[PDB]
Every structure is written in C-alpha cells, then in structure tokens.
C-alpha cells in the first residue's frame, strides 16, 4: 500500500513532552529545550519516538478528551453523533493508539459502536451552514462503493 | 399499585450500589444543618445522581427515564426519602432530584420543536429575558378543630406534581368537616412553595436567519428561584409536559389552541462561552507572571492581535475593564470610582472595530447598541398586567450594565431623548422615577464606551479642536479622555499595513480573563504619602499651562489622575502604591492633550 | 371524613400551654 488516504490521517497531532534535554530544536533560538515541556508533536517521529530509550526521550501525554469525555457520549446513543469535529479519522487514529498502549477497555467501546453506526447505513441506503453536514463525513468511503451496487442492479433488473 | 410497583421495587435494591459515593454526601451535607441551626451562637435537598453511574450497569432500569419519565421520577424519591431517616432519625421536603449527566443528542433548540420526543427528557440552552414575579403556594394545610383538641391533615395537589394526572382540588379552604366543630388551621405548622415563570429566548448565533428568535418557558421551584439574571446563558433541562383542556372543551373551541407546553425541570445552570475555579497550580503561575516589571506592556499588545499600534489606546481599555475602587463616604456622597473613556475619529481607522471585541471578553457586561429609544435607563412602567393585576417595573437595559461595561454607537447622530437621558445617569450613580407607579431608587455601578464621527470631513487641524462635534459639553465635562485618531500617510506604515491584513486569513485570551477576574477581588493600597506629592507638581504646570496650550483642564480631573494609577497597582497586584504608577499616568495624559 | 382527616400524632398540643397561660395570673412580681 502506498498509503493514498492514511499518511494524511498520519499528519495530525498529539499533545506531549520529555524526559530530557536535547538541543534539537526545529520549532526558536535556545536550542536546549528545557524537560517537561508540552510539545505538540505529529504522528510519524512520536509513533517511534516513545519506544527507543529503556526509558524513551518523550513522555506520552493522553489526550484524554478521547479518553474520557466522549467515551461515555459514544456509550449512549450512537444514531447521531460527533464522530468527526473531533477527530477527522477517528479509525486508524484509534487503531495506531491501541498497538502502543494496548488497553482492552477501549478496545471493547468501539467494537459496539461500528455495528450500530453500520446499522444505520445498510438500511438508510435504498434509493449546510458551515460544517453541518460532518455527522456524515467518515463515513465516505464506508459506504459509497456500496452505494453504486444497489444503483446498477436496478437498472439491470428494470427495463 | 402492585404490577406497576415491583420494577419500582426492583430498583430500590439496585440503585443503592450508584450511590456507594453518594450515601456519605446525602448525610453529610444534613449533619452541619443539624449543627449550625443547633449551635448559632441552610442547603436545599439537592442529590446529584450521575447517569453514567446508572447507565454503567443497568439498561432497563435507564431506557425509562429517556423513553417514558412518567412513571419512574417518584419511585426514585420514595427510596431517597426512606433513606435519610434510616440514616439519620435520632435528632428531632421530599429530596426530589437534580439528574444531571450526559443526554446523548437532545440538545433541542427551542427554533425547532419534538415530534418523538413529547414528554421526554430534554436539553435546552438560551438566554431569558422575562423574569416573572415570586409568589408563595401551598401544598398541604392542617385543619384543626378547636372542640375535641383534635387536628386534621388535607393535601391540595395542582400541576406541579409534574408526572401524575391528579384529579385536582380546587378548593380554599374546606372548613366545617363532618363534625359540629368550627374549623382552625396552624398555619405555621402548613407548608408552601413558590412560583416564577421565565421565559428562554434564543441564542442568535446558531440560529439561521430565516426567523426572528422564537421563545418557550419553564417553571421552576424553591431551590433554583432568584439565580437568573436577565442575560445570561443558562442551561437547564427538565421534563416535557402539556396541560390544560382544549378542543374538546364544552363548545365552540374551533381552531384555538389547547396544549400550551410547559416545562418543569431542574438543574439550572450558567456557562461562559463567576464559575471560574483554578488550583494552586495556575493560581501560581499568575504570581509567577505578576513578577516581571514588563506586563503591563506585554498584557497590552497582547489584546487585539489584529491592529497595528495605538498603544495609548491599547493600554487604556485594558486600564478601563478592569475598573477602580470606590470608597463610598460614611453619610456623604460617593464619588465617580467608575471611569468613562471617548473616541472619535475620522472614518475607517477601526473605531469601531475595538468596540466588539470587548463584548467576547465581557465576563457578564452585556452591551447594546445605541438605537434611538427611551428605555437606555428606564422601564415607562410596562407591566403587561403581570398575569392579571399587578404592575412591576421591568428593568430596560440598566441591571446588566452593574459592574460592567456597557458601549454605544453614534453619539452625534441621536434625537434630544438620550442626551438628556446620560446626563443624570452619569452624575449620579442611579436613576428614579414614578411614571405610572412609585419612585424607587436602584442602584448600577456602570461605565459608558463611546464612539462618534466628527461631521465635516477632514476638518479636525483647520479648525477649532474644541467645540468640534458640539454636542453638549456637559457630557464632554463629564468625560476625560477625548482620543482623536489620526490617519497620516507614512511609506512605511502603510507598507507595514499591507501585510498584515493579508497574514490574517487563516499571552492568550483565557489566561486573559483569568486574570482580571481574580484581580477584581484583591487590595486595594490608595496610600503613599510622596506619590501624591509628585502628582501635584505634575498637575500644577499644566494648571498654568492650559490656556498656553490647546486643552483647558477642570478640578474634576485630578480625580481622574488618582484613579488610573489606582488601577494601574491593582495590574500589579500590590497593597503599596507606588512610584512608578505616576509616570505612565503623566504620559497617557500627555498624549490625549498634546 | 375518609382520606387522611386523621392527622399525625402531634406531640405540641395548646392545652399543655393553655394552662401555662392560667398561671399569668400575680407570679412575677419583679416586673
Ligand atoms: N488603522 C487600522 N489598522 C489595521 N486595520 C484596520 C485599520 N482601520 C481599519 N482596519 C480594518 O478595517 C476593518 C473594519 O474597520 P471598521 O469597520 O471598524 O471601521 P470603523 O471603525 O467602523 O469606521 P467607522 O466607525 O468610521 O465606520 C477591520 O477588519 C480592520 O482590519
């Protein structure tokens, strides 16, 4: 795969700091950056960067606002909900969280939640403002291929 | 009530587990009750269950309380109620809910209605604007009959039960009982609760504009009265309910309306999009950042990150916001402990940019916008029959503006109603009028931000500068500082301005706020015996040299000199008055007069 | 009356005080 959809997904965020002091600076002058320090850090170097040490350079800050806040608001109903204005991927962000971490808590809460939110789009597929239409925004390639194959099989089947 | 009890029943050996955490909170908030009260020489019965707690381990005991909660409010108040005095009985008021927890998508605007979730529970947000009266109401007298020493008990229910379809009472006081015994009652030993009817607009920001903004109300009870002020953004959430008779009426009712929605909750709660709380961990990062001797000039261009200099206009809102004290004189008068700036300009040099931003930032100042009505200061006595007989004073726009700030627009550019409208409301600190009722004299401690045009162009250096807009100068006596922005053409300064509207397309506000409403509720020092000796000499010069130069100064405006370096400790935060406070003061006055 | 006309089991009557008025007769001869 060369990732035509992910590494994007990849070019988002984290909240996070360190262990010790480095003078690698690229973020300005004062090239020790002093320990304990919120840095926001992207994907691809801190995937990494939290597994060589022993004890690794970097310190995994949670954000815990996807740990938390919305875990009990994806518990209650989920027929219309903030999937996206949070996270613009939630799925392979949830994904490369659980290979470093590896909690089953959360590993459980969103194995309820894609049947349910499926269970909308099998049966809600026979055939504004600023955002607004994002409660259907990572749901594009889920269901659209599958969109096109109830389209054509009536046209087959009528005249 | 034996099928329709038993699921009730269920539930009251269940929930016990949910408040594991809550059974020392319910007694422990009673026992100081039984202590105060005992030991003089005070809260209601709130019990806030969590829905996470009962949604964590029970599905058909929580579907219920969204689907159909009408059956299952009053189970969970008859196992509360039984285990207060199982709890605590020995020394000699139900403890109805709060419910507060997450909904799961039932923030219904009230710009759109249900059609599924009649009688559901429901979350709404807005702004009130109403604020109805107060009004007692029984729910339970206590006959007695004097003959015979013996008492009676009798409960009058209305719609306030909110979930049963009681046949109702409509009766006083039903005396003279199937006895021969002239009837008494211990009113003392009756019980009552009160009434206020308040209306929710709404918010006009997410509304789309293809309506003006639609209302509905909600009842409340005793524990929640007199917490709302008419401008502020509450939230509350509450049970659906509809009442009254209609359609199928004796006769005659074609095409009325019989359902009027009420709503009868709980929980009513402000939000700021005074609950600010902080730890010891920020509460210290700000002694920390009040130990530099730069932040009064760092807090300055760090306000309005989109406009290029006046640094004597940046440092004088921001000196402004905040405000200074006033100490009012033991039977005497207080003086102006406010502070009331002026702007004008020649147009399009964002004078009126500044004037909004202000309003994001206002923590509870609500402005207007200065359209030409009488009602800037008063009420003219509208009453709208208060429901059928009493006439009250509804207040127009002066109890937002206490201990806030308040900003208006065209000045100039008014009818003769509202100049003679600031000019008592600026000496004195409050207004009073009888216009159909009775004098009565409230109190707003507020402060004006003007803006105005001067009328003939590019006129302000030809001329006089004084007399200059004309209108009446007892409002200009009654103000201080009279900015006037100029706009010269400078080939760096609008090559400087090229970009930075262009970089706009795409030490922060938070820890701003932070600030000034901690620094609100802090010393106050007033005294230093040498820097108000500096002050004169600063003043007395220019005393003699007010009519050698353009401006003619009053006595009025050495209270202004005290005031600004008065609040400048307070940026500070120090009980000492300074030195260094009677410079900034000179120089900001020196370039609104030169 | 059925329904409650029977009230609870006060413990303050008026004819415990009302001979605690009966003794306002010449007692208090301090003022
Ligand atoms: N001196 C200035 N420096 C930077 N930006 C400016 C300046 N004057 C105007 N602007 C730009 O103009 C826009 C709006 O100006 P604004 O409408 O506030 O003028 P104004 O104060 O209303 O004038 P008037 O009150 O006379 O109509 C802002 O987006 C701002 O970026």
Not at chain 1, 32 to 42: G, M, R
Not at chain 2, 364 to 384: F, P, W
Not at chain 2, 430 to 451: M, Y
Not at chain 2, 567 to 581: E, Y
Request: with cysteine.
């Amino acid at each position: 795969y060369y990732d035509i959809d992910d590494v994007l997904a990849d070019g988002t965020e984290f909240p996070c700091k360190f262990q010790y002091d480095i003078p690698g600076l690229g973020y300005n002058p004062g090239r020790p950056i002093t320990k304990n320090t919120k840095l926001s850090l992207p994907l691809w170097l801190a995937r990494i960067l939290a597994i060589v040490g022993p004890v690794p350079f970097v310190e995994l800050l949670p954000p815990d606002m996807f740990s938390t806040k919305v875990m009990n608001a994806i518990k209650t109903d989920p027929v219309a909900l903030d999937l996206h204005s949070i996270n613009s991927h939630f799925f392979s962000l949830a994904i490369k969280w659980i290979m470093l971490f590896s909690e089953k808590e959360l590993a459980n809460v969103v194995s309820e939640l894609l049947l349910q939110r499926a269970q909308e789009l099998n049966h809600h597929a026979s055939s504004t403002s600023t955002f607004l239409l994002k409660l259907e925004e990572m749901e594009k390639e889920i269901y659209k291929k599958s969109h096109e194959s109830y389209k054509d099989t009536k046209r087959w089947m009528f005249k | 009530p034996d099928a329709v009890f038993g699921d009730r029943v269920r539930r009251f050996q269940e929930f016990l587990d949910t408040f594991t955490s809550y059974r020392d909170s319910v007694r422990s908030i009673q026992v100081y009750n039984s202590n105060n009260a005992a030991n003089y020489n005070i809260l209601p019965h709130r019990i806030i269950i969590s829905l996470d707690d009962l949604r964590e381990f029970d599905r058909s005991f929580w579907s219920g309380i969204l689907v159909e909660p009408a059956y299952f409010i009053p189970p969970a108040e008859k196992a509360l109620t039984d285990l207060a005095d199982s709890m605590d009985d020995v020394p000699h008021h139900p403890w109805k809910l709060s419910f507060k927890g997450s909904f799961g998508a039932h923030a219904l605007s009230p710009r759109t209605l249900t059609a599924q979730h009649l009688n559901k529970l429901v979350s709404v947000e807005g702004i009130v604007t109403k604020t109805s009266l107060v009004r007692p109401k029984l729910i339970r007298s206590v006959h007695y009959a004097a003959k015979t020493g013996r008492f009676h008990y009798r409960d009058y229910t209305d719609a306030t039960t909110t979930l049963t379809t009681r046949i109702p009472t409509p009766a006083i006081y039903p005396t003279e009982d199937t006895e021969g015994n002239k009837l008494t009652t211990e009113y003392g030993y009756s019980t009552f609760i009160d009434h206020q009817r308040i209306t929710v607009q709404e918010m006009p920001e997410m509304a789309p504009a293809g309506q003006l903004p639609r209302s509905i109300d909600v009842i409340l009870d005793d524990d929640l009265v007199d917490k709302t002020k008419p401008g502020d953004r509450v939230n509350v959430v509450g049970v659906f309910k509809s009442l009254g008779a209609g359609g199928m009426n004796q006769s005659n009712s074609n095409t009325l309306i019989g359902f009027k929605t009420l709503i009868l909750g709980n929980t009513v709660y402000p939000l700021h999009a005074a609950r600010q709380m902080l730890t010891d961990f920020d509460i210290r990062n700000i002694n920390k950042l009040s130990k530099k001797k730069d932040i009064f000039d760092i807090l300055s261009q760090s306000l309005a990150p989109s406009i290029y200099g006046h640094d004597h206009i940046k440092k004088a809102i921001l000196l402004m916001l905040m405000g200074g004290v006033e100490k009012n004189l033991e039977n005497g008068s207080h003086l102006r402990g406010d502070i009331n700036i002026l702007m004008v300009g020649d147009p399009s040099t964002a004078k009126s940019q500044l004037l909004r931003f202000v309003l994001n930032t206002a923590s509870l100042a609500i402005a207007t916008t200065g359209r030409g009505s009488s009602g800037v200061g008063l009420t003219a006595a509208v009453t709208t029959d208060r429901e059928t007989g009493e006439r009250r004073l509804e207040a127009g726009a002066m109890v937002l503006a206490d201990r806030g700030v308040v900003c208006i627009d065209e000045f100039d550019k008014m009818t003769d109603v509202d100049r003679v409208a600031i000019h008592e409301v600026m000496e004195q600190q409050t207004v009073t009028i009888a216009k159909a009722g009775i004098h009565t004299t409230l109190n707003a401690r507020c402060s004006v931000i003007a803006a105005a045009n001067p009328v003939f162009g590019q006129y302000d250096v030809n001329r006089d500068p004084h007399q200059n807009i004309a209108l009446p100068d007892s409002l200009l006596s009654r103000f201080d500082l009279l900015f006037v922005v100029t706009d010269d053409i400078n080939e760096i300064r609008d090559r400087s301005i090229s970009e930075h509207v262009l970089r706009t397309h795409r030490v922060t506000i938070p820890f701003l706020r932070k600030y000034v409403q901690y620094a609100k509720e802090r010393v106050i020092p007033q005294l230093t015996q040498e820097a108000i000796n500096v002050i004169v000499k600063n003043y007395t010069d220019l005393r003699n040299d007010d009519n050698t130069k353009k401006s003619p100064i009053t006595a009025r405006t050495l209270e202004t000199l005290i005031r600004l370096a008065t609040a400048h400790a307070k940026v500070r935060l120090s009980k000492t008055v300074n030195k260094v406070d009677a410079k900034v003061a000179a120089n900001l006055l020196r370039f609104a007069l030169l | 009356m059925s329904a409650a006309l029977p009230s609870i089991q006060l413990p303050v009557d008026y004819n415990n005080l009302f001979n605690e008025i009966t003794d306002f007769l010449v007692t208090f001869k301090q003022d």
